């Protein structure tokens, strides 16, 4: 989470590989976030 | 997507027959075959650009037949999302009209100005873009906490680039030498073929349903309707940019007199009473079970009404036999009425001018079949 | 009250049209919108890393329709048909059966999310709130068998989370 | 019971009409099978016309004779155009059966039709 | 039989008909037109693929809404095979490739193939397995293909004694080989006696054969009523053209009858000559 | 933001406009989320010991039409009096 | 929480389960079938039956505006235990 | 222009452009709809419904549903009086039944004859 | 009564109905009703014959200009001997009124074809042709908008249902687009909702 | 003036004598009308009263602010087009009393 940017730099995720065990390294997808940080990261919030 | 049939002496014409109806959907007999609170989303999206004030046209029709006034706050911002609309749908006809004759960039930068308008609507009522959120008898749900601010500071931020649009374009010699020369239109034939709206705003009789019949709250605030010379596509297109400028300015005293009245109606036989009263009453678990299952019955009669849609008198009649059943809906189509006279805008012209014919109404055909 | 635009004339002092002969042979208003566009060239790009900074949102988007439970307990549903009444689309199709329990349950509870156009009408019509109208839009599905749900995959999908949705109605159950 | 007709006051120019209207399509028909590029020979297409000519042949009131001889003229102009394309024209003929009998067994093999 | 496998109403599109029918192949030519009158007659085709899912997904959405259902197979395990053909009424086989692969000869595709899946259909206890076969498939010389034919039909008589053996004549249709192999020539000039037929009378009978019931065992020969000399058909193709070594040998070996085993009469439908379609067919020449 | 001066020049000269000032790039002025909840405030009903349904009832005021015709008089009037001209605004006017 | 299939595979909440003679079993095939292993019979018994010591008691469910309306249900049946069609669970009474 | 008009029936069954086999085979219903005897309400009384037949509603055996190929077995037609409604369906053309109107008879209840003397009326609990 | 409930303006019922009453009285030959409702807006029930006549009156005149033409529509009315209903919608520039033009038609005996008087009739007309099947005479060009060429059957009516008879699907045996007979993948229940209880006194026709 | 705000409209330089022969065109095609019917009455009265406002000015703009109809030449367009009417009512015989009437069932709404 950064404030130095506008709004929709804000907070980014950054993905690690083999999170289900399927070398995630490439290819990252949407909905690999747990569902407690999809509240925070689209913005809904201040708190993490 | 329309069809187009023209038999044409070479680079020129003899007639152009638009061919539509490929948009077809069946609405009429769709929304007859429902209630009313069922069917208001046929009514939001028949016209998809302009989103708002579709749904306050057929809200005005419902509670002008129903006899319901709305309480005044749901009124005043009716009136600034009205005005949203207003902008954003004159913003989206000067950016089609801009990239279908060519001209790139200023498409992209008013739709970086309707993303956050997006945003706003977002806020709001939850959803992208066709916010239901007008409810017949006032409207549903106000608005969150911490949204006037930032209303205000795209209102600074807006009239700038709105500025600076006109500074990009309009005094641009070859975008007005493109169109100047081309569809002029008689007053006479402005009355008899029916246009509407920023064609009767353009070619020279001053006419506005906003300041004739005040549909809503629209004789207290402070503006003027431009009007046209020589009926012409330049002057209609700035015709276009100073409705803009009046727009900002409504919304500037909007929300300058905003009122702390109300959402809905009091009166819960025709909007459903809120959560907490809903949970702990009788009543109104029974105003909510029987309206969201049968809807609210509506006295008979024929109604019409028409409001001052971006694109013109958008016409909502209704037929209501003593039910919760519309019996017949119609709706009158400002793009259907401009595209009746394509005949006597494009007589004497040829087909790149037919294109700039097609940009300076705005079609969607959405709107355009009924 | 109106404001109309081009009454004018063009000038007769010779100082006025010269200016106006040379924006004709010295293409000087086109170099002005160089200039602008240069101008909005030197900013900075606002768009938005996709995959890893996603879009703002809303505490009430309309998404993923996920049916919620009771805390600590079993289904919230009734099978009361309210939504299916209020639904304009008619994509909810309910078939109840009570259980040996005593207390009124379904059997079938399907959406076609085809056909959902994505209101709020299920999500304001229901008296216990069971149905929500879910936090994330991203179906992207590649048969047209998996658009079809039943009760079990809306309760996978309200089981996957309810904090989200909880945390949801808990910052807004006061305009609804 | 006054009723203004619509073209003709008696079946004589119904029946003139009608025959004027079968002779311009007996005369358009290589000309759409020509420009559409159909697969059906002149034969048979021309005897499909005079089989929907022949289906209504026993209706003998001048206004309804007046009104569809106006629909087989709105379908004649629109086919001498290049309007309507293959998928209508090939639409009037039915070749995806649909090979539904009238038998009384066969109708009930597949019942719930009487 | 259990509900839902009796049929409901009218005809397809979501109307139930009776049978679920197992396509082998199913990615060329005639199964295709197979699969398009199932999905018409609205049934569930169980249709299993081993190439890419692109194939299938050109000819996926014929059938109606989830109707028709892909899977996976292949030319090694009974066990794969097995499973496809789990809960099934009837099974066809459609397979054949007209050239040698690297992997695959014409032995053991005609040969190991329908041995192995009539072995797990009579395993499974399916009805009215339907298999194909090519007409006049002799023991006799000039063609492995012909032969190995032969062989797949003593192999599909011989266990499961009650497979319903079809067989039809040199096929014509919109992706034709032999007729738009004739279209793609270029050249030589000999005589053969042959007769053609066209796909949708084939896969007609072929669904009648399969609706209709007690007609198993009984092997069936699909018959044009043309039946004429091979070099007026050749000159009659470079005239609607307007242009005027396996393969050559097994359209040069002949086309002779075997009239003893019935055709289309016994089923009801018209057999339609080679002027009309083949007029229809015949586009993309020259203008 | 987050820019050196001399581009900033070269943005201000390029476009005379101050674009430094107001740029659309919102950094500060983000309204502030996780709100305080609200309070609703109820209007002209609630108000016990008055709020009579016999007396607001709209719905049930909905008149029949009334119908005047059938299957020196001094008259002649226009249904609407006719609508007095307007006028350019004070606010920039043209010309 | 779940029983399972003799056919080899998970039953639901409901006893809907096929037979050997079906085939959409077979449109099973490769695809898993769903089901919500967490069901809502058993989670009923693991509730505390609470013994309130009054006769004729409220129910809302966890939160005001949060759940059920308000239903009052009745506590006289001596030996048999008041059941809130809305919460599904159970009360007694100790005076 | 007060022309040659001849008065005869109609014959629209050509021109409304529905096929045969839905035009002659399902017959037509006129009925006034009973009332809902769960409620006790004769407002929605006082039309004339046509209806048609009903047909096969199957099952869609992919979601459990009820399709149908029956695009005339959803009407209802809302008519003022029976004579209209037998002129219009003899009007376009399909066979049809109809049934008459049933009131409730006028009975005469009074409250002193339920609190009679020596007739065997007598409420017993009132 | 005072909140919550829309006001009437009883000068501009006034107005109306003295204009109303003006135009009856002024045009004996074709005149039937001048009906004005509660909001105020005039409407006036006509014989099929006088169409011409009156809208070049009501074009004209200088006591009531209504250059302004709107829409149309003949709203389908079964348990009427002549069905359908032409709704002209006329609008006055300098008046700011507007006046419904009802007169009634038949199934088949024409109403006289505006597009003569008023230049937007005539998309009007050919879309009404379309969708209903009423006819105008002595028309210019009279063809299919707003439904598909080779479809018919006047589709807005009440005899045709909501699920058209038709239902369009792509085949690979004929390589093209064919329509079948109509199959459903849901039955659209069509729910009873007529409450009975008489909500609206004042509307309580006489029986018989 | 010069060149006034409408569009399709080209200016007029002597309006008060075109006007005034226009209104006597109009009185005279009134003159044809049989004096029984009303339309006779209410257009002579209204046409009349028109007339002596016009002779009582001999100017523009308190012409044009008397007598609405704003500005000039739609005054003249409209006395043409009630010229025109007037030459069609000349047939079509409005005094007349009713066509047949309706089966009387029909205008009763609520259904
Ligand atoms: N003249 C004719 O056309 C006649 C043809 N027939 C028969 O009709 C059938 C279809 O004809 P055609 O046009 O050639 O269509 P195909 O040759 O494409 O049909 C054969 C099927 O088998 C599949 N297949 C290919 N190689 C193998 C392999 N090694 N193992 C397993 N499956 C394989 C093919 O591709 P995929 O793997 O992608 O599924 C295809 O689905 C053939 O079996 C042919 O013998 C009979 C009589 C006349
Ligand atoms: S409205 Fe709520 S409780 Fe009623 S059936 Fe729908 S989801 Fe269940
Ligand atoms: S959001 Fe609308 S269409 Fe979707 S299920 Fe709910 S009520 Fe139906
Ligand atoms: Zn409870």
Partial sequence: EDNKQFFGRHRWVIYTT???????????????????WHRWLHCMTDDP | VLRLVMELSGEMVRKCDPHIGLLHRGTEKLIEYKTYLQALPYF??????????????????????????????????????????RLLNHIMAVTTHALDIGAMTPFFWMFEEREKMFEFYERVSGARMHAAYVRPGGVHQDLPLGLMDDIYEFSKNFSLRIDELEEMLTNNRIWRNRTVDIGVVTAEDALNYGFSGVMLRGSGIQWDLRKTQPYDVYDQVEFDVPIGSRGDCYDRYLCRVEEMRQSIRIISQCLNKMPPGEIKVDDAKVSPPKRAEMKTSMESLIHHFKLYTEGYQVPPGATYTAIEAPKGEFGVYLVSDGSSRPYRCKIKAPGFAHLAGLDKMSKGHMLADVVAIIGTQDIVFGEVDR | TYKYVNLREPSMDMKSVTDRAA?????????????????????????????????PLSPRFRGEHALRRYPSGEERCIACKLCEAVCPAQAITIEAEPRADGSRRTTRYDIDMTKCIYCGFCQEACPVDAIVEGPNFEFSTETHEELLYNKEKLLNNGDKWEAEIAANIQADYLYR | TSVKPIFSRDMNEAKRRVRELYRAWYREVPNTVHLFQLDISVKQGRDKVREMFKKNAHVTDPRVVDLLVIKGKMELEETINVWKQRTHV?????????????????????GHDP | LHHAVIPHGKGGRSSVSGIV?????????????????????????????????????????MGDLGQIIFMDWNGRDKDSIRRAVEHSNVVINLVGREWETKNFDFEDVFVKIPQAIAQVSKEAGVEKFIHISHLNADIKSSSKYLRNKAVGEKEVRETFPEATIIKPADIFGREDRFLNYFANIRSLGKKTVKQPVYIVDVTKGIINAIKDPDARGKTFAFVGPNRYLLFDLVQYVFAVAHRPRDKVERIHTTDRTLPHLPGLEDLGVQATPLELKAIEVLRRHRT | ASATRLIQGLRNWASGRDLQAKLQLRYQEISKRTQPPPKLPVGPSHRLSNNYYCARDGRREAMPPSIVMSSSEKKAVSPAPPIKRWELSQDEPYL | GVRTSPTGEKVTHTGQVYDDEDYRRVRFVGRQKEVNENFAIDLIAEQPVSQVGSRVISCDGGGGALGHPRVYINLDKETKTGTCGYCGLQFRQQH | TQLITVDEKLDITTLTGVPEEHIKTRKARIFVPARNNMQSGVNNTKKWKMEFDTRERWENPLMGWASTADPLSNLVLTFSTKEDAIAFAE?????????????????????????????RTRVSTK | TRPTVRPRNDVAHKQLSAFGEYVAEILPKYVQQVQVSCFSELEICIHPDGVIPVLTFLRDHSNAQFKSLADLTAVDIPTRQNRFEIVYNLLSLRFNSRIRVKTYTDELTPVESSVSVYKAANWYEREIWDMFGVFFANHPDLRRILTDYGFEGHPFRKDFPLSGYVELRYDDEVKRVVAEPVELAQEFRKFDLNSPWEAFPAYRQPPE | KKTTGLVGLAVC????????????????????????????????????????????????????EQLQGGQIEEVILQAENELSLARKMIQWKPWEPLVEEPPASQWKWPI
């Fill in chain 4, 90 to 110: 090939m639409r009037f003929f039915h070749e995806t059966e649909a090979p539904r009998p009238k038998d009384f067994l066969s109708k009930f093999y597949v």
């Fill in chain 8, 91 to 119: 009007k376009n053309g399909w066979s049809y039944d109809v049934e008459e109107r049933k009131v409730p008879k006028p009975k005469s209840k009074s409250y002193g004859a339920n609190f009679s003397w020596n007739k």
């Fill in chain 3, 23 to 55: 924006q004709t042979l010295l293409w000087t208003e086109l170099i002005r919108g160089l200039g602008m566009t240069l101008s909005y060239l030197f900013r900075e790009p606002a768009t938005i890393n996709y995959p890893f900074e996603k879009g």
């Fill in chain 2, 44 to 85: 939001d999206r028949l016209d998809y650009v302009s989103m708002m004030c579709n749904e306050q046209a057929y809200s005005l029709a419902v509670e002008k037949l129903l006899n319901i006034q709305p309480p005044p706050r749901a009124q005043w911002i009716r009136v600034l999302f009205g005005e949203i609309t």
């Fill in chain 5, 21 to 61: 029918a197992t396509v082998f192949g199913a990615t060329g030519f005639l199964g295709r037109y197979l699969v398009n009158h199932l999905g018409r007659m609205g049934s569930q085709v169980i249709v299993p693929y081993r190439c890419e899912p692109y194939d299938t997904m050109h000819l996926r959405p």
């Fill in chain 1, 18 to 36: 083999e999170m289900n065990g399927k070398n995630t390294f490439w290819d990252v997808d949407g909905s690999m976030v747990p569902p407690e």
């Fill in chain 10, 13 to 64: 330089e002597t309006p008060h004598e075109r006007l005034k022969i226009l209104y006597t065109k109009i009185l005279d095609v009134l003159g044809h009308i049989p004096k029984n019917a009303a339309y006779r009455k209410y257009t002579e009265q209204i046409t009349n009263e028109k007339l002596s406002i016009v002779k009582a000015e001999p100017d523009v703009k308190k012409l044009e």
